[PDB]
Write a protein that binds this ligand. Sequence first.
Ligand code: CDL
Ligand code: PC1
Lengths: 85, 231, 78, 78, 78, 78, 78, 59, 59, 59, 59, 161
Amino acid sequence: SNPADHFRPNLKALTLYAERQHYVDRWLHVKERWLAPWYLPWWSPLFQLGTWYSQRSRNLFLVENHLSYRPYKFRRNDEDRNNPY
Amino acid sequence: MFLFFFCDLFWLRLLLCMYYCVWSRLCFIVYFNCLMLIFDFLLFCLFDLYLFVGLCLFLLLWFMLFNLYSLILYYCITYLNLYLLFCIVFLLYIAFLFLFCFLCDFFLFNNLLVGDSFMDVFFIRFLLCFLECFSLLCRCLSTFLRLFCNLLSSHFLLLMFFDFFYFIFVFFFYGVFCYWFILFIFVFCFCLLFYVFLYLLDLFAAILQLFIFCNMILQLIMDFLLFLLFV
Amino acid sequence: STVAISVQGLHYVGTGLAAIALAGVGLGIGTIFGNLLVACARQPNLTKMLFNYAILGFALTEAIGLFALMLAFLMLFS
Amino acid sequence: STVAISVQGLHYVGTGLAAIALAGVGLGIGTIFGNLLVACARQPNLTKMLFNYAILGFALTEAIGLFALMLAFLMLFS
Amino acid sequence: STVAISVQGLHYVGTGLAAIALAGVGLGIGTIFGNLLVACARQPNLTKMLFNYAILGFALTEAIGLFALMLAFLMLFS
Amino acid sequence: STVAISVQGLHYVGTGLAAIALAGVGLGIGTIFGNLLVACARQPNLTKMLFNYAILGFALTEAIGLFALMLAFLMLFS
Amino acid sequence: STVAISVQGLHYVGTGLAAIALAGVGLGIGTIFGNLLVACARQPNLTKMLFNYAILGFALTEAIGLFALMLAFLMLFS
Amino acid sequence: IALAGVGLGIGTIFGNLLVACARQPNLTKMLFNYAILGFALTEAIGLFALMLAFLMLFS
Amino acid sequence: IALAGVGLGIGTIFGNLLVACARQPNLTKMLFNYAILGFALTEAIGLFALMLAFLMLFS
Amino acid sequence: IALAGVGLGIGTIFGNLLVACARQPNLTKMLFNYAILGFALTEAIGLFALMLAFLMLFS
Amino acid sequence: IALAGVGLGIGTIFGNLLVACARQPNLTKMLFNYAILGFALTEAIGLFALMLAFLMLFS
Amino acid sequence: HDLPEGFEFMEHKVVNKDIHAPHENLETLRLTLTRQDEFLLREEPVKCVTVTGTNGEYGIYPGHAYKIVQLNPSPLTVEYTDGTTKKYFVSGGFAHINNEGSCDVNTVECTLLDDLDLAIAEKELAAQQAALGSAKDDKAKSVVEIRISVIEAVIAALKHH
Ligand SMILES: CCCCCCCCCCCCCCCCCC(=O)OC[C@H](COP(=O)([O-])OCC(O)COP(=O)([O-])OC[C@@H](COC(=O)CCCCCCCCCCCCCCCCC)OC(=O)CCCCCCCCCCCCCCCCC)OC(=O)CCCCCCCCCCCCCCCCC
Ligand SMILES: CCCCCCCCCCCCCCCCCC(=O)OC[C@H](COP(=O)([O-])OCC[N+](C)(C)C)OC(=O)CCCCCCCCCCCCCCCCC
C-alpha cells in the first residue's frame, strides 16, 4: 500500500468541478451566438459541421430503447456494484 | 472535474534553456535506426519514411528526462499511468496505420493473407490473416504494457530495497561496536553491492526500453514499406 | 442460506503464483546467452552483432516477466 | 440443506494461475533467439532474413501470453 | 447429515488452470521457429517451404490453444 | 450474510511459491556455464570475452531471481 | 463479521514449497557437469580452466539454492 | 519433489559421460572422477531436501 | 511425483548410451557398466521418495 | 503424474534409438536389446506409482 | 496431467524419427516400426492413467 | 580443341545409393586407405575401422551413414573379419564414409605404428619443448606446439600398446 502511494503526481495545485449540464448549456449558447448571424447561411459547411453531428447523436440517444438500466452518469456513489442508484 | 498540476521537469526545462541557447552537435542517439532504414544502395522509397525521425527524437528526449532522472530519490514520473501510455501509443501507432490506410492501396495488405496457394484458403490462410490483424493491435498493446510495467516494477523494487537498507543501517549499526560486528559488516557490504547493481540495471533498462518502444513503431512502418530500385 | 465470505489472505497466494512465471523467464534468458557463447565460439567475427541481438531478446523475454510481476504487485497491494 | 457460499478472494488464485502461463511464452522466446544467435553465426549473409522470421515468432508467441494476461484482468477486476 | 454447498468463486481457479495450458503452446511455437531459423541457415534455398510448414505447425498448436481458451471462457462465464 | 475472515498463515504459502521462481533461475545459470565450457573448449583463445558474457547473463538472471525474492521476503513480513 | 484465524500447520506447507526450488538448482549442477565432461573430451588441454569455471557455476547456482533454503528454514521454525 | 530434479540431474551427468567416454576413451578415469564429483554435489542438495522432509515428518 | 524426475533421468542415461554405443561400439561392455552405475544412483534416490510414500501411507 | 516422467523417459530412449540405428544400422539388434532394458526399468518405476494409486484408491 | 508427459514423449519419438530418416533415408521401415513400438508402450502408460481417471470419475 | 579431364582415366568411381531404395544388410566395409596418391589398402573388406576426427573417435562399421570426418594426428585401427588388427598412424587428412558400405580414408601420411620409435619420439619432444620456451614469436610457438601435439599423440599411441 505505502509503496504504491509513491506513484502519484507530486505537484497538484487546484481542482475544479462543474456539472455536465451547465457547461454543455454554456457551449450551446456560445455556438448559437456564433452561428446565429445572418451572414452564415444554414447551408454553409461551417453551420452543418456545428449542428448536424450533435443533432444526430441526440436523436440516437432519444431513439434508444434498451431492455437494461443504465445508471445515472453523475450519481453520488458509483463504487457499489450492488446499488445502481 | 478539472485538476491543475505541473510536470516535474521545470528545473530540467531551465537547464535546457541555459545549455541550449547556443547550438551543439548531436552524435549519440538512443535509437539510431530511424535515420538509416535502407542499407542497400540504389534502393529508394516514395513514401515519407523519414517522417518519424522528429517524433522519435522528441519522445526519446521526453522519456529520458523523466525515466532516467527518476532514479534520483523522490523524483516523480508524472506520466506514469497505464491509460495515458495507452493514449500515447494509440496516437503514434494509429496515426501511422491511418497514414498507410489513407493511401487507399489495398494491395498493400496482400501479405496479410499468410501462406501460398497450396494451403487451404478458408481453414488456414484466412485464420492466419485474422491472427495477424489481431497481432498488430496486440503489438501496440504489448508496447505500452511493457513500457508501463518495466518502470513500475523497477521502482517498486528500488523503494522496497531502500526501505530495508534504511531500516538495517539505522537500527542495527550499533553492532559495529558489538561482538557481532562481522555479520553487520557482511550485510552492509551485500546491501551496497545490491544498491550499485540495482542502479546500473535500472539505468540500462530504461534506455533499452526506450529503444524497444521506438523500434516497435519503426517495425510497424517498415512492414508496409516498398523499395524501388534505381535504373 | 445465502452466505457471503471475504477472505483477505488469499491475495498472498495469487501473488506467489505469478512469481512462478519468472522461472520460465529466468530460464529463457539463460538459454539466449548459452547460445550466444556457443555462437561466438563458432563465428567470433560477429560477436558484437550477436551481443546486440542477445540483448534485444533479453528485453523481450524480460518484458513478459514484468507482466507477471505487475499482477503480483496489484494483488499484493489490494 | 441448500447452502450458497461466495468466497470473495478466490479471483486472486485464478489470476496467479493464468500468470503462470507466461513462463512458457518467456521460455519459447528465449529458445527462438538462442536458435537465432547460433544460426546467424552459421550463415551470416542471411542474418537480416533470419531476424525477420525471429520477430514473426515473437509476434505469434507474445500474442498467446496476452490471452492469459487478458483472463487475469477479467478475473482480477471482477 | 446431508449438506449441499454451492461455491460461486471456484470457476476462477478452473479458468486459471486452463490458461496454464498455453505455456506448452507458447513453448511449442518457440521450438518450431527456433528450428526454422536453424534449418533456413542450413538450406536457405528452401526458405519458403520451411516457412509454410512452420506456419502449419503453428496453426495446429494455436488450435489447441483455442480449445483451452474455450474451456477457460466457458468456466469463467458458466 | 456479510462475513469477513482474515487467515493469518497464508503468507507462508505465498512465500513458498515465490521461492519456486528460483528453480528456473538456478537452472538458467547452470545452463549458461554449461554452454560456456563448450564454447571455451571449441574456441580456447576466447576465455575472457565469453567469461564476461557469462557474468552478464548471470547478472540478469540473478536480477530476475532477486525480483521474486523481494516478494518472498515481503509477504513473509506482511 | 470480523473473524481472525491462525492455522498452525501452514508453516509446513510453505517450507515444502521452498524446498522445490532446490530441484532447479540440483538439475542446474548436473547440466554444468554434464557439459564439463564434453568440454574436457573436446579440449583435454583445458581440463583445469574449465574445471575452475564449472566450480564457479556450481557455487553461484548453489547460492540460489541457499537463498531459497533460508526461507525454507525460517518458516519451519516460525 | 525436490529429488525429481536431483535424480534427473544425475542422469544428465551419466548421460554425457557416456558420450564423452565414447568420444575420448583414453580419459575415462578423469571423466569418471568428475562425474562422481558432480553426483556428490547434487546429492548434497538431495540430502538438504531430504532433511527438511524428515523434520516436517517427525515434527 | 519425485519418481517422474527419476524415471526420466534413467531414460536420459540410456538414450545417451545408444548414441555412445552407436558412435564407437567396441566400448559397449565398458559403457554398459557405467550406465548401470548411473541407474544404481538415480534409483537409490527414488527409494528415498518411496520410503516417505510408505511411511506416510502407513502412519 | 509420475507416469508423465515415465512416459517421457520411454520416448526419450526410443528417440535416441532411431538416431543410433540410423547412424550404425548394423547394430540395431544390440541397441534394441538395450532400449528394451531401459523400458523395463522405467516401467518398473511406473509400477510403484500405480501400486500407490491402487493402494490409496482402494483405501 | 500424466498425458502431458505422454504426448510430449510421443512427439520426441517422431521428431527423432524424422532426423533418423534424414540421416539414413534407406532405413525408414525399421525406424518406423520401432517408432510404432515406442508409441504403443507410451500409449499403454497413458491408458493406465486413463484407467485411474475413469475409476475415480465414476467413484 | 577440347581436352580430357584427368578423372576420365580413372575407372573406379564412387557408387552412391539412391535415397529412395531398399536397404541391404552388409557385413563388410570396403576400405580404401590412401597416402600421397598411393593406396595402402584398396577396396579391402574390413570388419571395422576406428578413426580419430577433430570431434572425437568414430567406429565405422558396414552401413554407417554418409559422413565426412576431418582427421587429426592419431592412430587408425583396421579390424578384419578374421578379427585380426592392423594399426596405422596418420598425421592428417579426411575420411569419407558412404552409406553404400565404403570408406575412403585419404591421409597425407599413413605409417604402420610398428615403424614409429618411442625412444626417438621422446627425445624429439624435449627438443621442441626447449624451442617453445625460446621460440621467438607467437607464430613460432604455435608451430612448435603443433609438433608437440603430434609427438605426444605418437608417444601416447605407442604407450597404449
Ligand atoms: C479560480 C482560480 C484561478 C484559476 C482559474 C482557472 C480557470 C480554468 C477554466 C476551466 C479549464 C478546464 C480545463 C483545465 C485542464 C487542466 C489540465 C492541466 O492542468 O494539465 C496539466 C498541464 C501541465 O503541463 P506542464 O507540462 O506542467 O507544462 C505547462 C506549464 O505551464 C509550463 O509549460 P511551458 O513552459 O512549455 O509553457 C510555455 C512557457 C515558456 O516558459 C516561460 O515563459 C517561463 C515562465 C513559465 C510560466 C508558466 C508556468 C507557471 C508556474 C506556476 C505558477 C507561477 C507563479 C504564479 C504566482 C501566482 C500567485 C498567486 O511560457 C508561458 O508559460 C507563457 C506565459 C508567461 C507569462 C509571463 C507573465 C509575465 C508578467 C510580467 C508582469 C510585469 C508587471 C510589471 C508592473 C510594474 C509596475 C510599476 O497543464 C497544461 O498543459 C496547461 C493547462 C491549462 C488549461 C487552461 C486553463 C485556463 C486558463 C487559466 C488562466 C488563469 C489566469 C488567472 C489566474 C490569476 C491568479 C489566481
Ligand atoms: C550515462 C550514465 C549516467 C550515470 C551517472 C552516475 C552518477 C553517480 C552518482 C554517485 C553517487 C552520487 C551521490 C549524490 C548524493 C546527493 C545528496 C544526497 O543525500 O543524495 C542521496 C540520494 C538518495 O540516497 P538515500 O536513498 O540513501 O537517501 C537517504 C535519505 N532518507 C533516509 C531520508 C530516505 O542519492 C541518490 O538518489 C543518488 C542516485 C543517483 C543515481 C544516478 C542518477 C543518474 C541520472 C541523473 C543524471 C543527471 C544529470 C544532469 C545533467 C544536466 C542535464 C542537462
